[PDB]
Each structure stands twice: as C-alpha cells, then as structure tokens.
Amino acid sequence: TEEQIAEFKEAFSLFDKDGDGTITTKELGTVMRSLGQNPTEAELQDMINEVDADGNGTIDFPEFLTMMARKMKDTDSEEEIREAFRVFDKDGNGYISAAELRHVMTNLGEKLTDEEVDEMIREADIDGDGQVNYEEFVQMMTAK
Amino acid sequence: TEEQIAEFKEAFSLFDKDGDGTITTKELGTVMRSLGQNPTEAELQDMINEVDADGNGTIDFPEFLTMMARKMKDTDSEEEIREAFRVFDKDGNGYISAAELRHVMTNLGEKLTDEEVDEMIREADIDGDGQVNYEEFVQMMTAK
Amino acid sequence: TEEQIAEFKEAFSLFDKDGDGTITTKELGTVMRSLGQNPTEAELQDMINEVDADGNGTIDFPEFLTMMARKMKDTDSEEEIREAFRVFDKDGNGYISAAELRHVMTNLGEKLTDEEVDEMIREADIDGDGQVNYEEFVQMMTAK
Amino acid sequence: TEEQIAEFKEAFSLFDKDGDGTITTKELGTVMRSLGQNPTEAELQDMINEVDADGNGTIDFPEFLTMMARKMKDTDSEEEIREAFRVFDKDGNGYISAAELRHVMTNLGEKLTDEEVDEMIREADIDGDGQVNYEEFVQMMTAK
Amino acid sequence: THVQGRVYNFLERPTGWKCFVYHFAVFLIVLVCLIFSVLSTIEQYAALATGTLFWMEIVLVVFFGTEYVVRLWSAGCRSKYVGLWGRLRFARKPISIIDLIVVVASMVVLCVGSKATSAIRGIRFLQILRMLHVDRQGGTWRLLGSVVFIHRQELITTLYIGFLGLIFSSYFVYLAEKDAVNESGRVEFGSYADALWWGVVTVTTIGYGDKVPQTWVGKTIASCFSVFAISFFALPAGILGSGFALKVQQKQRQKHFNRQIPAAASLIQTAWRCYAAENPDSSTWKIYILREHHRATIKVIRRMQYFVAKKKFQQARKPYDVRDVIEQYSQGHLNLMVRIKELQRRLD
Amino acid sequence: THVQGRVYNFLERPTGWKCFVYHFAVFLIVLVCLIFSVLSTIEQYAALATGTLFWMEIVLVVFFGTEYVVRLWSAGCRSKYVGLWGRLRFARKPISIIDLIVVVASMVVLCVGSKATSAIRGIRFLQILRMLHVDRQGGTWRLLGSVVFIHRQELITTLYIGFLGLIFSSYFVYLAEKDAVNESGRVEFGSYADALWWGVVTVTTIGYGDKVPQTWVGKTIASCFSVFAISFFALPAGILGSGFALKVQQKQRQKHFNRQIPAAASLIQTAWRCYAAENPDSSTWKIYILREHHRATIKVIRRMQYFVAKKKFQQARKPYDVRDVIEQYSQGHLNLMVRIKELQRRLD
Amino acid sequence: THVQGRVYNFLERPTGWKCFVYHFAVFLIVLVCLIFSVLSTIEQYAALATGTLFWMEIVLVVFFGTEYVVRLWSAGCRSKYVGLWGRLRFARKPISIIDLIVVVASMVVLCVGSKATSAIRGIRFLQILRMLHVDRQGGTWRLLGSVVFIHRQELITTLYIGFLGLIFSSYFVYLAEKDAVNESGRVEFGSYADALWWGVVTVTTIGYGDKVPQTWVGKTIASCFSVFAISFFALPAGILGSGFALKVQQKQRQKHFNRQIPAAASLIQTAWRCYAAENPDSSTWKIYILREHHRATIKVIRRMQYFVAKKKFQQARKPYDVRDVIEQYSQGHLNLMVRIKELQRRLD
Amino acid sequence: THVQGRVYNFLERPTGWKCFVYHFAVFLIVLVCLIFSVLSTIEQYAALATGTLFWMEIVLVVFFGTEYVVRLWSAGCRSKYVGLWGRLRFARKPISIIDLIVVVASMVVLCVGSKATSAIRGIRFLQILRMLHVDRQGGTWRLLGSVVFIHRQELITTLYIGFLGLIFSSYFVYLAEKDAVNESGRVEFGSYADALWWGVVTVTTIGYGDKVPQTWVGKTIASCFSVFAISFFALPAGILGSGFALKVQQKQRQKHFNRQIPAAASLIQTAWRCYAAENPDSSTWKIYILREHHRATIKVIRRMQYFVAKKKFQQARKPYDVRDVIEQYSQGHLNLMVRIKELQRRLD
Numbered sequence A, B, C, D: 001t002e003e004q005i006a007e008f009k010e011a012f013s014l015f016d017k018d019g020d021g022t023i024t025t026k027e028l029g030t031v032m033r034s035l036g037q038n039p040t041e042a043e044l045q046d047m048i049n050e051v052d053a054d055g056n057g058t059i060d061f062p063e064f065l066t067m068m069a070r071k072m073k074d075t076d077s078e079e080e081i082r083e084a085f086r087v088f089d090k091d092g093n094g095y096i097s098a099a100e101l102r103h104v105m106t107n108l109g110e111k112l113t114d115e116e117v118d119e120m121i122r123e124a125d126i127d128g129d130g131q132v133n134y135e136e137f138v139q140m141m142t143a144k
Numbered sequence E, F, G, H: 001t002h003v004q005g006r007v008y009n010f011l012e013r014p015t016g017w018k019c020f021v022y023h024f025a026v027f028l029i030v031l032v033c034l035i036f037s038v039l040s041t042i043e044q045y046a047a048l049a050t051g052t053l054f055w056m057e058i059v060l061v062v063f064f065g066t067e068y069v070v071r072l073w074s075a076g077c078r079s080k081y082v083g084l085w086g087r088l089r090f091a092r093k094p095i096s097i098i099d100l101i102v103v104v105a106s107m108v109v110l111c112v113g114s115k116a117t118s119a120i121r122g123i124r125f126l127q128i129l130r131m132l133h134v135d136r137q138g139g140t141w142r143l144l145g146s147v148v149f150i151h152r153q154e155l156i157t158t159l160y161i162g163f164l165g166l167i168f169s170s171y172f173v174y175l176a177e178k179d180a181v182n183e184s185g186r187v188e189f190g191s192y193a194d195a196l197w198w199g200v201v202t203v204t205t206i207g208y209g210d211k212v213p214q215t216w217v218g219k220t221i222a223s224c225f226s227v228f229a230i231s232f233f234a235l236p237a238g239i240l241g242s243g244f245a246l247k248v249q250q251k252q253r254q255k256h257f258n259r260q261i262p263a264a265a266s267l268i269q270t271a272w273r274c275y276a277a278e279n280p281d282s283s284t285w286k287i288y289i290l291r292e293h294h295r296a297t298i299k300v301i302r303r304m305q306y307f308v309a310k311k312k313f314q315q316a317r318k319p320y321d322v323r324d325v326i327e328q329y330s331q332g333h334l335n336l337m338v339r340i341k342e343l344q345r346r347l348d
C-alpha cells in the first residue's frame, strides 16, 4: 500500500495547496470552480461532513485515507444500488425499458450528457423486446 | 379526440411561446400579467405542482393533456363541493340564506364581483322564505 | 341600549375616520401613535385578531359592538384573575406581601408607574403584618 | 462574609460602571471586548440567562451574589465532569491516553493553548504506559 | 315552519338536557321492559311477567309508532328528504328499517296473540332488538367500523397467527392425551374438537377448567402455548383503544381551526367561476378590464385554480405534521434568498 | 402566627419525610385496626378481636377528633377559610364530612355499646370507611374523574357494544341450551338470567367454570363470542392508562416553563389598569404626557389589551404543538418580507 | 410474453377482486377439508369422513400440483428466476418447500393407503400444514419477526423477571402447602412441578382452578404474586400492538413522499458516472469543456458525491422528525446571516 | 497488561458470539441443575436426583469459585477497583454478594452433608437463587426500577382505587351471602377473609371458581364489580410496556447524536480553565496578550462560561422537542431583524 498512500498523498496535496493538512469548504470549492462546476456552499458542506469523523469541519489526511480505503464493491452498496433501480421498475420483475431509462437519466437528478447515456445503454444486452436486466449493470459497476 | 388534441395543442402553444414544450413559472406568470392579474411566485408554483407528475418543475404537453382530460363532473368533486357548502350551513338542513351567501361570496376567499353574485343567486329558485337548496347549484355546476 | 350604541358608534367613528366601517392595523396604529405609544405591528395584529369573528382581518361595527357588549365581571374572568395572582403566592394561603407585589408590578410585564402602584396598594387594607388578601382586589376590580 | 460581599460589590462595580445595579448584554460585551475576546450576542445572552432568576434580562446584585455563593466542589458537578470525560474513554476503564487527551484539548471545543495543555498533563502522574486516571483530575479541580 | 326543524333536532340531533332527559327516559323504559322479559323466563315469575307484558307492549307500540310518524314527517326539514321520494329515501336507511320492523311485528304479534306461546318467544327477541333504537346516528358503529378498517392488516395478522398456533398446539395435545382419563373416569380429550375447545378457552385467558391436561407432555405444551400465544388474542384491545382515542381526539380538535372557512370559500368561488367560464355571454368576462384566443387561456388558468383550491382545502381538512413545517420552511427560505440576490443585484 | 400555617402544611400539604412518616404511620394504624376487624369475623378469633377493638376504638376517636379540631383551627391560614363562615365552608367539603361522620358515629356506637351486636356490625363498615382519610387532597379521585370525562365517548361506546353482544349472544346460547343437563344431572342454563351471568363472567375473561355450554351450537357461539367480544371489556385499561400517564406528565412538565410568570403579570396589570380607567380622577391618566374624547379610545384600547392578555396567558397554560410553530413561522416570514420590500423601496 | 407475468401476479402478488375471490375460495376449500378431518376424530362420524377424505385428497393433490407447476413456470417473469438455476432458487425458499412437501407426501400416502391407519394419522397433520399456503408472501410472519426483533430487550426483560417471580413464589408456596390436603382427600401440591404448574396457570390469568392454596400463608403469597407479577406476562400484548401499528403505518405513509425518486435518480447517475471514471477513454470526460493530474481530483469528487447521494437517499427512505427541522433551520439561518454580512460589506 | 481487561470484558461486558455462547452455556448448566432439583421433589425420582446432585454440586462450586476469583482479580482493569480497597468495593455490590453467598453456602452444605436432609432443603433454594447470576449488570432490574419510579403516581393511584373497590364490594358481598350454602352443603363465604379472597381472584381475572356467589344481590354486585373494577389491575401492563419501550428507544437513539462530544470537550476545557484561574502564577494568564483588577472579571466570566457549558451539555444529553424549535426560531428571527434594522440605518 506504499504506492497507494503515495498516490493518496499526491492527490491530497492538490486539495491542500499549502502546509495545513486540512481541507476547508472554500479550499475545495476553489478546486471545483477551476473545473467550471459552481457548487453551492451547502453542497461542499455535505461533501465534507461525510468525510470527517472528528466533527471539526475539515478533512484530515487520515480521514482522506479512510475515505479512499473503503470499497465500492460492498455487500451493502450493491443492495442500495439495486434497490434504487426498483423505484423506476413497473411490475418489479427485474427489467426496465430502454426509452424509460434514457428518459430518467437525461432528465431526473443530475442530468446526464446524452452520449453518456448512449454509452450506458450499450454496455448491457439491450435487445429482447427492448427490456434490460439491471442486475447486470449492478454487477458491472460493482466489479470495480 | 383529434379536434380535442388540436385545440389543446393550440392552447399549449399560447403558454409555450417557443419550441421548448415545457412551461416554467415565469413562462406562466407572463401570460397572467398580460391579463392584469399579478400572481405571487408561490401561487404559480402551487399551480404548476398540481399539473406535473414528473416532479421536475414544468408542464410537459402530455401532463397538460392529462389535466385537460379528466372531468369536473366527478364522483369525488361533487362530494367535495357539497361538503364545502356545509361549512356555511346553520343547522345543516341543506339550505342557506340568500343574504348570507351574498355576504360570503363578496367578502371571503377570492372576493367576487357583485354582478357575478347577482348572476349566481338568480340561477337557483331563491324564493320560498329566501332559502335556497345548494344541491341544485351542485348539480348545475357539475353538469358541465 | 340606544344611548349605549350611540356612544359606541361615536367611539367607532374615532377609529374609522372615514366611511369604510372597518378598522385596519394601520388604522389603529395611527390612533395609538397619536397617544405616543408606539406599538409593534404584531401587537396590533393580535389586538385585531381577538375582535373579529369573520377572519378577514378588520373590525366590523357589529364585531366592535360584540366586544363592548360582553362583561368583565364574568364567571370565568374572575377565576382567571384569581389564578393569575397565585403564580406569585408563596404557600398559596391567599395572601401576598406588600413589597413583593410592589416589586412585581413595577418590574414584570408592562411596567407600571410607581404612583399607580401607590394607588393600587392603598385600595386594600394593607395592614396586618403587611399581608394583603388578593381576593379583595379581585372582587373590587370585578365589580365594574 | 463581610469581606466576601465587599469583594463581590467591588467586582460588580466593574460590570455596572454606573448607578444602575443591573447588567445588560451590551454592558458585559463591552467589558469582554476590553479583553479582546469578541463574543457573539447570543453568547452573552446565554451567559446572562443562567444568572438571573427574575426573567427580566439583567443581573441584579443579589443574583450576582447567588451566582458567587454556590460552590463548584458539588455533589452534582463532580458527577457531571466525571461523566464528561467518559465520552472520550475507550473501554471505559477509567483511563485515557496522553496523546489522545492532548489532541482533544487542543482541537475540540474552545481550543486551548498548547502550553496550558502542557501544564494540564503534568498535573497528574502521566507515567505508567502513558495512561492517566482522570478521577485524579476530577478530585483536583473539584478541590477548589 | 321552524316547528319542523325544532322537533327534528329534538329527536335526531339532540343537545342540551331536555333532549337528553327524554332520550335517557326512553332508554329506561326499554331496559325496564327487557328486564321484565328476563323475568318472564324464571318459572317463579312467569305469572306476573306474561301479564304485564301485554299492557306495556301496546303502550310502547303506540308510543314508538306515533313517534316514528312524527319523525318521518319532521324529516322534511332536510333538503334531500323533502318530497315523497325523499321520505322513501329516509325510510331506506338501516335504523328506520329497524324501527319499522319492531313496531309492525309488535302489531302482528299482539293481534294474533290475544286470540300463542310462540308470540312471547318472538317478543323476547324484539325487546332485545329495540336497543338498537338508542343510537340515533350510529356514531358508535361508524366509529368501530372506521377504526377496524384502518387496522385491518394487524387484526388479520394476529388472527391468522393465533389461529395457527391454536390448531397446531391443540393437535399436539390431542396426540398427547387421547388416552388420558380424568379422576372421575371420563376422557376429556376424546376428539380434536374438544382439544380445540380447550385451546380456545385457554388461549384467550378464560379457563373454565372443564378440560385439563394430565400428562407431562401436555402440560409442557400448554405452558409454552399459554405463555407465548395468548398475547395475540389481546392485541386488539390495545389497537382498538388507541384507534378510538386518536379518532375521537382528531375529530374534536378539528372543531377549532378556521382556515377551513376561507379555503371552502375559495373552492366554491373558483368552482362557480369555472362554470361561468363556459357560457360565452356570461357577465363575469367583464372582470378583465377583445377575446381572440383568451377563451382558452382563461379556461386553463381557472381550471388549474380550481384543482389547486380543491387540494388545498382537502389538505386543510387534516391535522398538522412535520412535513408542513419542513416544506414551508424550505419555500420561505428559498424565496427569501432569491430576494436577497435580487437586491444584491440592485446595489449595482 | 407562622405556627398555624406550619401545622397546616404538616397536615394537609405534606412534604419532606417527617410529614410522610407521620401519614404512613397513621395509614398503618388504620390498616391494622381493619385487619383486627377482619379477624373479628373468624369464629376462632372473635374472642380477642371484639375485646381489643374496644380500646383501639376509643384511642382512635380521641386521636382523630383532636386531630380534626387542630386541623379546623389551623385552616385559617388560608384566606377563604378565615372567619366562622370560612370554617363552616371548610367543613362543607367531602373529606371533612367523612372525618366528622366517622368520629361522631364512633362516639355514638361506643357510648351505646358499653351499656349490642349491631354496634360491631357498624364498626366494621366504619373501619372500612376510614380509608378515605388517607388521600388528603383527593388527587387520585380527581385524576380518575378527569381522565374518565375526557374519554367518555370511547367508554360509552365500548360499554354499549359489549352490552349488546352480551345480550344477543347470551339469548342465542339460552335457546341452544335450555334443555342441556349437566353431568351432575342439574340444568345450568335454566333461565336467561343465568345465561347473562355466564356471559358476564365469560366476556370479561374470568371463567369460574360453574356454567359451561355442552352442545355444539353453544360452543360455536361461545367461541365466536369469546374471541370477538372480550376485547371491548379490556379497552378501558389501555385508554385509562394512556390518560393517566399523559395527564400526570403534562401536569409535571408544566412545572418548568416560565413565560407564565410574565403573562400573569401582564394580565393582572392590564386588568387593574382597565379598572383604573373608569374612575375619572384616577392618577393613571398622567401616563399620557386635554381629554375631549380620549376617554372612549383609551377604554377601547385597554379593554382589548385585557382580552389579549387573557387569551395569551390562557394559551401559555398549555403545552406546545406544531400549530405554534407553523403560525409563528408564517408571521415572522411575512413581517420579514414586508421589511424587505420596505428597504427595496428605500434604495430608490 | 405478457401471459406469464399476468398469471404470476394473479397467483403471487394478487390485487383486485377476481384474484381475491380465487384465493378466498382456495382458503375455504382447505378449511373445509380440515373440518372434515376434525370430524374424522369423532367416532360418530369416522364413517363418512374417512371415505370422503379419499376423493377430496386426490382432487386437491392434482389441483395444487398443477398449480405448483404453473407457478414455477410463470416465475420466469422475474429476473433472478430465469434460467434453470433461477427456478432451482425459486423452489429453495420456504413456502415452496412447504407446498412441495405437502403434494409429494399426499401422493405417497394416497398410493400406499389404497393398497393403512397411519396414513390418516399423517393426513390430519398435512391438512393442518396446508394452512401455511395462504400467505403467499409471508407478510404476517415477516411483520411479526421484525417487530419482535426491535423489542427484543423488553421481552427478554419481562420474560426473565416473570420467570424469577414464578420460580421463587412457587417454591414458597410449595413449602407452605406440601402437607395441605384437598377436600377430596388428595394432595394438590405434591411436588414443585405442580406448584410451577399452578404458578404458570395463575400468573397468566387463566385459572383452571384445579390447584388452589388452602393455608393462609399460601393465600397471602398468591395474592401478592397475582397482583404484582401478572402484569409482566401482559406487557407483550401492548408492546407488540404498538409495534405492529407503527410498523404498518410507516410502511404505508412512505407510499406518498416523492423525493425518493430524485434521490434514487441521483444515486444511480453518480454511481455510473464514478464507474465511467475508471476507464481512461470513456466518453464522459468531455463533460469538462489536458488531464495532467485531473484524473485524481475528478475521481475524488465523484467518489464523495456518490457517498453523499447514498446517505441522502438512505435518509430519504425514512420518515421525518424534529432533527431535520432543527438542522435545516440552523443551516438556513447561518447561510442567511453570512449573506447579510456579505451585503453589509457591499455597502462599503 | 491487556490480558486483564480482555478477560474482564469477556466476563462482565460481553459482546460478540463467543462471549454469548459462554454465558448461554452457563445458563443452561444452571437451568439443568435446577430441573434436577425439581425432580428431587418427585418421589419417583428422588433416587437419582439426590445422588447426581452431589457430583454436579462440587463441579459447580469449583467452577463458580474459580470464576469469581478470576473475576475479582480481573476487575483491576477499572480505575476505581485498583487497590485492595478497590477490590473490597467491588465485592460490596449486590450481585457479587450473591455469588459469594452461593459459593460459600455450597461449601458449607456439601462439607456438612457428606458426614442431612436439611442440606437438600437448602440446596433447592440455592439452585433457585443462582439464577440472579445471569444478569451481569442488572440491566433488567435497573430498567424496571426506573420505569416504575417514573410512573409512581399512576400506580399508587390505581392500587389505591382498586384496593378500595375490593374492600367495599367484598364487604357488600359478605353481607349478602354469609348464609348462602353451596350445593355440596358447605358455606363458601364464611368470613370476610374469604370474600376478600374471592375479590382478589376475581378482580384480577383469574377465576379459579372455588368461591361463587349464589344470591341475586351477590351476582348483581359481582357483575358491576367485575365490569368496572378489573381495569385498574390491568393498567400497569400498559403503563410499564410504554415505559420500557420509550426508555429503551431513547437509550439507543442517543447512541447517534454527536454534539455531545463538542459539548463535553467544552465543559472539561472551561472547567480546567476555571481551576487554572485561582493559582496566580498559572501560565494560562498569557492567553490575554497588567492585572490591576483583571483577576475578578476574568474569574467572573470563566465561572459563568463553566455553568453555561454545564447546562448546554446537560440539555444535549436529552432528545429533541418542539421547545427547541420554537426558542431557536425566535432567537434567529430576532437577531435577523436586528441586523435588518442595523443595515436599514447603514443606508443613511
């Protein structure tokens, strides 16, 4: 994990930008606005609440490492994603429509680029009366 | 229903005023202020929440059609109107006073024009000790 | 009651100041500021909520008359006043101290003029170890 | 207690600064800003709510005396302090780590000066695998 | 014609004390006639009872019949009851059917019996049946049915589960004790029917004691059963109590809030405005001061306003909750900060 | 004269432990005298009991009589009890009537009995009756009556319904089993009275087992009855428990909030100000610094202020709820946005 | 292939009335077959029952077997059930195991019995066991298990305490009454086992009356026991009732709030965006308009956004509470006053 | 010395499964030894039981004695238990007294009995008494005592009232039925003691049926009694259930909020700062950068800050309520409008 913590120290330096070792709300909003994103204050606050375990209001480097250390291919995260799909499932059979999914992605929540959706649909076998098994997507994007 | 959807597409064009196909809060407040009404923002918001079923915050044309499609002469709307009258009924016998009704219309809620009330009263048989059966009004304005 | 309603119409004219027949919050705050009182908006609002029975937000003349018509020497108001004293009663025996009462009047709530308190104390037999029976005050100021 | 009330009258004069005998929120914030502290309004309000028993919003001299009169070495305050330590105790054995305590003092709550913490740690026998018995600190700072 | 409504509310929607004294008196009369019927069963007092139940019966039938006719005439104060057909609708409801059946069957039995033991065999049930006459509006029954409907899932659940436990444990006891003989020499658990009987009378905490298990297996099973299963036949009490309480309390707390009145006004007003919209030559068109396409848009707006008022009123009919607070705080804070930005721009 | 109030609060409004030790002791004495009366019934111990209940009786009458006189004299610490008429009002309340009856009847029975078996026949009831003496303020009874009154509809409902089910199911069982003979040869369900007895003892989950149904019809009906009707005789427990709990908890949570004190101050102050208004030459007229019409308007404003304070205080006497939050948020946000517009105009 | 899903939801997730009529009918058939089995025990009716339970049995096995095969084929409408292995997973769950056991054992017993009294000895239990077939989704059982798990501490507590009180008081009674002889000459409390029996049947408020204490010591102890211990065997009713109610009510109030839908959308979208991050040549990189270190920071932000959405959605799955109100009010007021200061600076 | 704390938390504060498996095993051993003691009473099995209860007894005493010594040595991981006096304080608490009594008395009885029937007469009670050993922290008992204390008024109330109703109704029944003879020729209600017995066993819904009233007066009174009084002996169930539930739920919901941590930090920090104040040459005086009168004012401020932190933390230890919302909304809106006025002045 020495190369891992090397890359994580590198990545943490990009947010730190000085010898503090802590990340402020402003200290993150600047980095994001460099990317042309324009987040809200409360958004950065919510991002930063779910990293720190001290409650002080910034991200220490061990907290950063704790974030990076835990895994997306998780027993619980799989269930969360699977249960998120079911909100949009008619009849709950484990299948959803192509056009319906395209509509949900491009309109609801953080709206996607159309070409991103064009990539998304073709990852799975979409044929067979237009239906698609979403557990396939789950296993895919939980494969890491 | 082809002439029906023709007229509804026509009517939707007056709110759309462009090639969007969606109606914004501003996009409706402009039309209303052209009529000299001056609604509040939250009022337009409430108007527009009760049209859309997507939750995005605008009125798609199918949502507009869904609104137009359902009927006022309804099993439930009849009961709602009938139960609304009873708030102003003394003794609950199904009758209310002429002057009382005139007072309620011209003062409470969205105050009416007096001549509108003069029209309203004469729609029903008002004679017979000044009492009026309001279920008559219910059947009338639920006849469509 | 013809002289009574005469005086009440007279008194209502002082608040009306025009041919409206209704009293607005401003319409009362002006009269009060003529007396050099400077009430808060919410204060006038609270004053005016407890007069009107229509809920519209002003005082019709019948509502004014209804206010004037009901009596202070009441079965319930007596109990309310009596139960208000008991908050300041040590040991609940029906007596309170002279100096304690003087302190409560001049400091808590709408602070009184000292000479008003000097009038108040001498209305009742204050002698007898400085204690005073407050039910005497109750019967007095509920005698009207 | 004549020298005690003498010193307390002296100390109360520093806050009073005039012949009022009551302490206002401003009247305390000025004294504190003379020390270069810059408290918030709500902070002074909270300070002053927990002194007065009249509810009027200022500190009478008897209330000041009541504050000074009651003791820190208390049956209840001891328990409160002891139960406050236990939030930071792993395994609840009555011991906490040196470095952990130093971290908590200098970071959480009203952050301390480092040298103050250096004083704090050396008050207790810190040796013995770095652990420290915090009930010792309790008995110390509750000795008055 | 105030006499009509006056006697109506005296008979149907009573308030005060005189009304209450009357209804209470009638209750005493019917209870008293019942308890004479009770004493008609006891051979010691079938002498007096059968005799005195002849005078009282005719007194009551003339009383309640006169009362019913007065009632049915007085019902015309309502609006849906005026007209012959209105009356015929008034007799259609249950409690009036009950009253009619009682009086008519009383007439039949008294006219056949005077010139007849099956008579009294019917009289006892009619006396029993008249008690329905007390609740003049079915408030008790409506309350019960409401609260039961709300909690239908819980009750079906506990019924199902306690049923199963009864079936299985009683079968096991039957297997355990089909041979066991009582001290008196008879066999209590002859059949599975009797084990079911024992199970019912046990699980519900009555315990007549007419059937008892003797063998250690039966006692073990009965212990586990009685300790772990009884609590399913006792849930309904708590559920129904909470439901009754909450139902009544909301129904009387809603006697206070007054925003219902403006919302109702608004609803009626926009409804009739919408109806005025259709007729082209309505006078209401003057409110806007020529109508190229204005017909459409005006109908659209008024339609929406109607459904808005509908839902606002509907939601006003219910008590408050945290959702209201959260949503309104959000809306207010957002509108605020919008105006903050608007002014922050005005400074430029 | 602090002695008077001191002994009063020692006897009537006790706190601490010494008070509590005293009252507990008196309770033990009365319980002990009762249980001697209990043992007066047992023929084995009617010897000692009748004898020792002569000494204890005179001891207790002198005790409680002295105690009552001390109490009645000490009551003058209150304000509505001073004066002979005040005392006569103090003896008018129930528990003092109880104490007086007990002591006086004790004197009567002891003076007639010494020179008499009906005596002891009365003594047992007086010993039973003295237990009322424990609750010095009727807090238990007041609590019960309050909570019962609040939930009167629910209780009348369940009483009515369970009553009906009892009547009807017991009649049906009577029809089913008027012929059924017990194993011992006697007929349990002779009369409808006995079926009602069975029904009462069944529906309420006691089950003495002295009456049992034998025929399959009766068992079927008894099963359905016992499963579906018992829960109406068990609601009151849950209802009353919730009521007691909530009542007590609100009554002790209201020991904390202090806005009652300013509101009470305000109320008293505006009330007396209003009363000062009537007298023309009151001094309070100087607060405004000539009185052409000012009399009227001042009376109007002060009158309103009084009723405002009245209702504010009244509402302050009660706990908090969501209505408060909603209304105050509305008012604050509205006043805010008004000021926002005022400033937005100030920029021009 | 809509036929498949159609019959599935007709059989497994029923709605409407036709579905309900079908399932209710099947329930009646199984209950009716049970009660014939009940009548197989009664020697008066073991004649007809044993005979008619031969035709019905084969009718039901063909019915339920055909039904099971249709069901197992129709399950493929789901996604985790397609494939042979999917089916084999569908038969793995409990209720399908139950159905299979019932049908197969029915076939075995009917084929051995025709050419056998142990047969019917098995049939009765299978008839009893088929009742599990009613709940098609185990909703009752899942509800119970949930609510029991939530309140495990309370139930263990009351069980422990009532257990101890039973043990100790029953030992004391045994010591008191090992010598006591019944009126009929037999000794009820021979052994501590019997005292435990009495204790169980007492503490839980059944009271068969087969064991009673005779001596004053036993009655004293039984009084204190029955008055102070019974309430621990009756807590579970109230606990479980409250739990069922609240569980159901939250589960149906969550049918309304719609912020779950945007939150779910957001979650899925950021999850797949994060997955698109890893592959270098993903198209999604065009959203920002060269990538010296941007890989890292973009992965960091997207990772965080994912966990943010995760928790927001998770918290959206639950009802509202005061914490939400407090926190959001704080946040809004703070952001407000920040902007106030920002503008107060803009005036300079 | 981590071994010490490790075995401590294995024995005293168990978590996981291995701990749980151990404690469950020990529970099984003690239950099993008990049930052998149960079988020691039955004359059929006093042979084996008395013999096998000699080996098990010595096994258990060596087990629990070794266990106690290990435990008492391991207790030194705590801080108030280190030192001989710490240990002597550890043995002072109840459950350790229990364990010591059991082991020591086991040694005494086994050493006297081998060289003795009173022995086993003691053994049975010790086996019964060991069950206290299960709860390692008295959580059950502490919970019960807490919840009982909170609801002391309600329970005293219902106890008092049900007591009175019992006394009075049972006296009335005694008067009614002192002459009534049972079918078997004996008189059930000989004495008021027996009527009290009947009343207790009735009012609490047991109903052994050993005493029944015969005369119409007694049945009337028993009906009214059983219908209106039983509900007071059943309140405690509902009260205690609600209390247990709410207690546990708050105790586990408080496992989440984290503002306790900053508030605790603040408290400790200001406390020690105040203590640093007294010593003149403390280093902390440098925080302000000569001390003419600054001593006083600094002590005043720090003192206040301490009590402020004290109360803030204390209030943070409790759940949320509407009071918080109302007060904080008020404060925020007021501070807001103050700043609004400040800026409205800045425009000038």
Ligand SMILES: COc1ccc(-c2csc(NC(=O)[C@H]3CCCCN3S(=O)(=O)c3ccc(C)cc3)n2)cc1
Residues within 6 Å of the ligand: G161, G162, G164, G165, G166, G168, G169, G224, G225, G227, G228, G229, G230, G231, G232, H144, H148, H155, H156, H158, H159, H162, H232, H233, H236
């Ligand atoms: C009618 O008014 C009432 C009625 C009851 C109560 C009430 C509160 S707590 C309570 N019992 C109890 O708290 C427990 C514990 C204390 C003794 C009574 N029971 S024990 O018999 O199970 C029992 C007995 C012996 C042993 C070794 C363990 C357990 N009883 C309060 C008011």
Ligand SMILES: COc1ccc(-c2csc(NC(=O)[C@H]3CCCCN3S(=O)(=O)c3ccc(C)cc3)n2)cc1
Residues within 6 Å of the ligand: F144, F148, F155, F156, F158, F159, F162, F232, F233, F236, H161, H162, H164, H165, H166, H168, H169, H224, H225, H227, H228, H229, H230, H231, H232
């Ligand atoms: C099925 O529907 C029902 C059933 C019951 C009720 C209900 C509310 S309050 C209540 N009893 C009670 O309030 C008390 C007090 C009034 C008499 C009845 N019980 S007493 O016998 O204990 C009793 C009896 C005699 C004495 C000297 C003291 C105590 N009973 C309400 C509805």
Ligand SMILES: [K+]
Residues within 6 Å of the ligand: E204, E205, E206, F204, F205, F206, G204, G205, G206, H204, H205, H206
């Ligand atoms: K029972």
Ligand SMILES: [K+]
Residues within 6 Å of the ligand: E206, E207, E208, E209, F206, F207, F208, F209, G206, G207, G208, G209, H206, H207, H208, H209
């Ligand atoms: K029983």
Ligand SMILES: [K+]
Residues within 6 Å of the ligand: E205, E206, E207, F205, F206, F207, G205, G206, G207, H205, H206, H207
């Ligand atoms: K029972």
Ligand SMILES: [K+]
Residues within 6 Å of the ligand: E207, E208, E209, F207, F208, F209, G207, G208, G209, H207, H208, H209
């Ligand atoms: K029994």
